Amino acid sequence: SGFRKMAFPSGKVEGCMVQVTCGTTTLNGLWLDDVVYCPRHVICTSEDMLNPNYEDLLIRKSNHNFLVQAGNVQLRVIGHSMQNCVLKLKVDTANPKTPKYKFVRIQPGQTFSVLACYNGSPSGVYQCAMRPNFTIKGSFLNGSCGSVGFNIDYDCVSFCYMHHMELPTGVHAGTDLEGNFYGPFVDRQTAQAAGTDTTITVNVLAWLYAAVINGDRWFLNRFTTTLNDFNLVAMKYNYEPLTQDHVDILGPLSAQTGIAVLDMCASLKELLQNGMNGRTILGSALLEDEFTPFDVVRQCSGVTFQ
Amino acid sequence: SGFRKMAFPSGKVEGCMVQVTCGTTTLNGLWLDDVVYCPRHVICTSEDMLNPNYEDLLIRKSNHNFLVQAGNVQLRVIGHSMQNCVLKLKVDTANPKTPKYKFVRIQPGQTFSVLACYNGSPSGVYQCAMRPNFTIKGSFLNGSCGSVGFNIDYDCVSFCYMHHMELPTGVHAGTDLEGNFYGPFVDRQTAQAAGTDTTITVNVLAWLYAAVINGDRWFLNRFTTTLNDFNLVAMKYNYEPLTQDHVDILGPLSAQTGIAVLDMCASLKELLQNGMNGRTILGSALLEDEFTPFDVVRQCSGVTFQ
Ligand SMILES: *[C@@](O)(c1nc2ccccc2s1)[C@H](C[C@@H]1CCNC1=O)NC(=O)[C@@H]1[C@@H]2[C@H](CN1C(=O)[C@@H](NC(=O)NC(C)(C)C)C(C)(C)C)C2(C)C
Numbered sequence: 268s269g270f271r272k273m274a275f276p277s278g279k280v281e282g283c284m285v286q287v288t289c290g291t292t293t294l295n296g297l298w299l300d301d302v303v304y305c306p307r308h309v310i311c312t313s314e315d316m317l318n319p320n321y322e323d324l325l326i327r328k329s330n331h332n333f334l335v336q337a338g339n340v341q342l343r344v345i346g347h348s349m350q351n352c353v354l355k356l357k358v359d360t361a362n363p364k365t366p367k368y369k370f371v372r373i374q375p376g377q378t379f380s381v382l383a384c385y386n387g388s389p390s391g392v393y394q395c396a397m398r399p400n401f402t403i404k405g406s407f408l409n410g411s412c413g414s415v416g417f418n419i420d421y422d423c424v425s426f427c428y429m430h431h432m433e434l435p436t437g438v439h440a441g442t443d444l445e446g447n448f449y450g451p452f453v454d455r456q457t458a459q460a461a462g463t464d465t466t467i468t469v470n471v472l473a474w475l476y477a478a479v480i481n482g483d484r485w486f487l488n489r490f491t492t493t494l495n496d497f498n499l500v501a502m503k504y505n506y507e508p509l510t511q512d513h514v515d516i517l518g519p520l521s522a523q524t525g526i527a528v529l530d531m532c533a534s535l536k537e538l539l540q541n542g543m544n545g546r547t548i549l550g551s552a553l554l555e556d557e558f559t560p561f562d563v564v565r566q567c568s569g570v571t572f573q
Numbered sequence: 574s575g576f577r578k579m580a581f582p583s584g585k586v587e588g589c590m591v592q593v594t595c596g597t598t599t600l601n602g603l604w605l606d607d608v609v610y611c612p613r614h615v616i617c618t619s620e621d622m623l624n625p626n627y628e629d630l631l632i633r634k635s636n637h638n639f640l641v642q643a644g645n646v647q648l649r650v651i652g653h654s655m656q657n658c659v660l661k662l663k664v665d666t667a668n669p670k671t672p673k674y675k676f677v678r679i680q681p682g683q684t685f686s687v688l689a690c691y692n693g694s695p696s697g698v699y700q701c702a703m704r705p706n707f708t709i710k711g712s713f714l715n716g717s718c719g720s721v722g723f724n725i726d727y728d729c730v731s732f733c734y735m736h737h738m739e740l741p742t743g744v745h746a747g748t749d750l751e752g753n754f755y756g757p758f759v760d761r762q763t764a765q766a767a768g769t770d771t772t773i774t775v776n777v778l779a780w781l782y783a784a785v786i787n788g789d790r791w792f793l794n795r796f797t798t799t800l801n802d803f804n805l806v807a808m809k810y811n812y813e814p815l816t817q818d819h820v821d822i823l824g825p826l827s828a829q830t831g832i833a834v835l836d837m838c839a840s841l842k843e844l845l846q847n848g849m850n851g852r853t854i855l856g857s858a859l860l861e862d863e864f865t866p867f868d869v870v871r872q873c874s875g876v877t878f879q
């Protein structure tokens with residue numbers, strides 16, 4: 268029993284972190300095989316942040332300008348290339364700890380674990396979700412750029428985020444491993460704003476299921492409803508519309524608890540309209556939306572990894 | 574910026590997990606050097622749970638009755654001994670991944686990371702706190718026994734918990750690495766109850782500091798108070814008394830924010846008496862007490878590890 272904000276074991280990723288320095292700028296890089304991936308603005312100085320011309324900046328750099336350290340070991344950069352917003356530094360040595368991996372661009376609502384690093388060294392790990400507005404509510408300080416987000420599928424590590432910046436609202440933005448930003452952001456110091464955020468309805472339902480699985484049933488009722496009537500209420504509260512795909516996705520949990528998805532939607536409807544009334548669900552006073560239906564199954568069934 | 578429930582990187586611990594089987598019972602073990610540590614009830618059958626006589630049960634076991642697997646590798650048990658509630662199985666091979674470690678018995682209020690395992694394989698990681706009543710609010714299912722709790726101090730891993738059981742209230746209990754239970758519990762199926770739990774006042778204050786560091790200042794006031802007057806209010810709300818030691822411990826955070834500890838105590842006093850009023854602190858609607866003053870510093874300063 269029990270329910271926690273569970274992160275994936277970080278071992279396979281820790282072996283891939285390195286330190287990249289170019290001048291006075293130091294940040295993290297991901298070393299897979301003979302390549303080190305890192306944000307391209309590692310070549311910028313405080314003077315270039317406002318409106319950097321990356322092609323130019325990079326053309327004035329030579330392989331010796333890049334100091335890459337893997338622990339006490341220094342890696343020799345034998346080539347470099349820029350792919351969108353990331354730098355790919357070719358090194359003379361293949362990482363012997365390279366796990367089986369793949370790069371993926373996730374969709375909003377999906378969750379992943381973050382290995383926060385500083386100077387090539389892992390400081391900590393936590394779970395978070397890609398918000399509908401393409402930001403994440405992270406925990407990052409100076410020197411954190413380069414830190415990656417990932418998910419583990421059996422024996423494979425799926426990298427899906429590389430950290431780049433913080434917004435005025437204290438939320439964060441980054442890219443996928445191919446250098447493509449998630450959201451409408453750019454890597455330059457110009458006014459940028461994250462859009463209006465909304466609640467991931469499908470995750471909230473998965474969480475209510477987790478609650479039932481763990482014994483909290485006070486919010487349940489006999490009522491029911493339709494996808495149509497539900498979504499009308501949802502929009503009034505800044506919740507993401509619910510689709511048949513989401514309904515099908517919640518299937519396993521509906522089957523496990525015997526509570527029909529549309530029935531659970533009625534419970535939620537009432538929770539939105541009348542609040543929680545000083546009561547809690549799974550130790551919380553707010554409806555949590557950073558647990559995907561799969562996260563719930565994984566934690567309430569005991570799925571392990573290599 | 575940002576604040577998350579951050580766990581320690583699990584890499585160093587993942588290398589030490591193994592699978593221990595005795596008959597039909599399988600659970601996890603911790604392999605350090607040439608020894609495998611695991612809960613002693615791995616030798617029990619469903620028939621022995623009610624009132625097991627461990628000395629007897631163990632006297633009827635021989636080294637070949639213990640199957641220990643480290644991945645695809647099988648480890649030969651060349652000896653065994655029982656230390657309080659844990660079994661120490663001597664093996665023919667020293668773990669080559671053994672990190673620099675130490676065993677510690679923590680005190681209530683302290684936090685640590687848990688590496689939940691099943692069949693010797695890491696399922697996930699999360700941070701939790703040893704409650705004043707000697708239990709933890711974990712996330713454990715059948716097969717989880719053996720999973721350990723730890724903290725990382727620079728380059729050293731400090732093991733402080735080994736999981737053993739779940740209480741009717743859905744909370745958990747275990748021991749230190751020397752087999753001594755935390756709390757008044759025993760490893761047998763007899764009626765046992767966890768005591769009344771209370772809130773870790775000092776952690777709540779550290780969290781309010783984290784809130785100020787992150788920009789949430791709505792709960793602050795000009796008022797102040799004395800340790801005496803505060804503790805009177807606290808007891809009425811089931812909060813742990815506050816001591817001068819706690820005040821000294823919160824020093825660095827008081828210095829960093831410029832808000833005096835006794836001033837922060839006044840803010841808290843008001844929060845207890847008038848509630849939060851539909852407002853939140855660091856994204857929460859309840860006062861969080863699973864962040865120690867050190868956790869806050871570590872996350873708001875960027876402390877890393879080997
Ligand atoms: C990274 O660790 C980097 N630091 C440097 C330092 C020199 C050159 C390149 C880089 S990348 C850091 C992470 C930040 C620190 C606090 N929280 C984080 O997540 N990111 C940055 O410093 C980016 C870099 C420069 C600005 N920047 C920021 O995050 C700005 N935010 C900002 O300008 N935001 C707008 C929305 C207005 C664009 C602050 C937080 C003010 C430092 C790049 C975008 C190139």
Ligand SMILES: *[C@@](O)(c1nc2ccccc2s1)[C@H](C[C@@H]1CCNC1=O)NC(=O)[C@@H]1[C@@H]2[C@H](CN1C(=O)[C@@H](NC(=O)NC(C)(C)C)C(C)(C)C)C2(C)C
Pocket residue numbers: 268598600612614615617618622713714715716717718719737738739740741745759760761762763764765766
């Ligand atoms: C461990 O993984 C173990 N499983 C076995 C199976 C056979 C022999 C030995 C062991 S240790 C498991 C973890 C549990 C599972 C659910 N959540 C957990 O944390 N622990 C146990 O099975 C312990 C074992 C037997 C009972 N037990 C329990 O946790 C009971 N709880 C219980 O009896 N609680 C009282 C307070 C009434 C004592 C349940 C949850 C009912 C299985 C030992 C204490 C020897």
